[PDB]
Amino acid sequence: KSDDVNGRTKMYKNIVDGNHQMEPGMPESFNVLLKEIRSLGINIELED
Amino acid sequence: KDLLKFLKAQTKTEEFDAIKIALASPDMIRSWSFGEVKKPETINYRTFK
Amino acid sequence: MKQGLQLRLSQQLAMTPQLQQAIRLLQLSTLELQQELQQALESNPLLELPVYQGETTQTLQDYLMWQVELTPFTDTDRAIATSIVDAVDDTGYLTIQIEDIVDSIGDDEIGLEEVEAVLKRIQRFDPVGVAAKDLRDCLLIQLSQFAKETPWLEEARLIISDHLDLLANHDFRTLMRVTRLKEEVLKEAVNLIQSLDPRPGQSIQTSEPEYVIPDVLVRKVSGRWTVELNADSIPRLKINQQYAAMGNSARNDADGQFIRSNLQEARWLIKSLESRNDTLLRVSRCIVEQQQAFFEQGEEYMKPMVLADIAQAVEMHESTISRVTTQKYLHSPRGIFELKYFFSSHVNTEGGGEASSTAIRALVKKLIAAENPAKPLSDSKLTSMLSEQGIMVARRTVAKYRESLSIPPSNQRKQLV
DNA sequence: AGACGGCTGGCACGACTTTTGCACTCGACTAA
DNA sequence: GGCTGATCGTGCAAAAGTCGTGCCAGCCGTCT
């Protein structure tokens, strides 16, 4: 029920098909935050 | 491009664990960027492009 | 001395040449002039939130994508459907060809049968006839959507099949001769076919306002018309007072010379801009004086106007008038029209009248609109209307005006009442 | 079923418009 | 020489385009 665009349609199709399985993805608000931090002279990145 | 995994490659993510943060470097900033802005213009009202 | 018209004597040259700055000023560039001024001000150093729209309208592209996701299809089938959705026109038709789609697929296993199956599935969508790229195909799908209980269904299908040409030319007699259909019973089927919602994908498009910024505004409230330019749109430049107060105090000859040159250039540019603004205001006032007669006479009875006639109303050369008229727009209570739209050719009329081409076209369009649908007005018949107007005109050349108004041929405009 | 009839439509010559491509030599001297 | 600098500078004209209006060749709708 959040900004995960790829997750919303997936969950809707799952409910239509009665899957009831949750696929996380990763919220776009975090992407916005990362871009905003990078807009400053600040280095930030997500490792593995 | 066979276009079947091309769409699939769009939906991908890393572990993203143990994120850190530190100071930046200008060459790194240029790496982040793809181009440089050089005019204060934002949008045209003649063609809306 | 004496008054005379002898034609042999000495003289001097004409107006002095190479007035490039004045030539640019005479031409109106609107925002382009603003951009040039910004560039010059960059060259000249002595011159001077929480609320967001947040709208995610589907535009029927997202609706189509959701339908594709909600529909059961193979991975190849899903990819083909996505590719088909990519090549969809705003009106609801497919921009690319089926062979073009197959080529874009670039798969040997991909076949025309699969493309046809996808199109049928594509046809199997709301609205019907999606990306049909063929009016008959979309019409056929829409007809197939409805039930067969409706009367004149098979006849309508037959007409849509291969009788489109007669309807295009409105060839009712030829269509009756060919299809051997019931006379005047086909009118109901024709009306039903007219009730087929052509371009069903047009509903996807949403209206977007056209931001038109006028230059001159006219009110004429209680008479007393007064032309006023858009003060907000009026450019304004400022002199750098801090830079101005540092020229004499400079102890360096190079710096002082540079400051003096920049000040002279800025003064010349400001003078040119002010002169251009004043000339534009004077031209607007003269036009409004001319347009007041046109505005009172109305669009139908608009008087003819000449470029030389307006240049006479002003003191500048007609070249300046032509340059100023370029990229010129103004706002009036009746509406907003280009300055050049005022000028029109003068058509010799009965009693010696000179008839504006635009006004003549408007009157002809009004007359043609008020015509019998069963019998469209003929171009030769338009001569009778022109004679009724009491003003001579060129009926032979009136077809050019009719085509200019995008008026279809009268024979082609014929339709059943 | 072939011919009148008005349309249609381009082509032509006048008749109005039009854009751009145009800066001397000063009054300082400038003397070899 | 080599242009070299500078009051002061609100067309114009000339070849080019573009339209006005008429003028002829074809075409189909038709009824003799």
Answer whether C211 touches B (CB < 8 Å): yes
CA of C258 to C1' of E1 (A): 30
Q: Are C88 and C95 in contact (CB under 8 A)?
A: yes
**Closest by Cα among C244, C323, C301 to C22:** C323
Residues C31, C53: Cα–Cα separation, whole Å: 27
A13 vs A19, A21, C266, CA distance in Å? 8, 10, 66
Q: What is the Cα Rg of chain C in Å?
A: 32
Is C406's CB less than 7 Å from nucleic acid strand D?
no
Residues C147, C153: Cα–Cα separation, whole Å: 9
Query: Which residues, 6 or more positions from C336, have their beta carbon under 8 angstroms from its beta carbon?
Result: C212, C214, C329, C330
Residues A17, C304: Cα–Cα separation, whole Å: 71
B45 and C213: CB-CB below 8 Å?
A: yes
Is C121's CB less than 7 Å from nucleic acid strand D?
no
Q: Which nucleotide's C1' is closest to C382 (Cα)?
A: D6
Take residue C201 and report the two structure tokens written for it: 């994908």
Q: Are C160 and C136 in contact (CB under 8 A)?
A: yes
Q: How was this one solved?
A: cryo-EM
Residues A4, A26: Cα–Cα separation, whole Å: 6
Q: Are C371 and C364 in contact (CB under 8 A)?
A: no
Question: What resolution in angstroms, rounded to 1 decimal?
Answer: 6.8
Alpha helices (H) in C146-182, listed in sequence order = 153-162, 164-168, 172-179
| Rounded (10°) CA dihedral C396, C400, C401, C406 | 130
Is C174's CB less than 7 Å from nucleic acid strand E?
yes
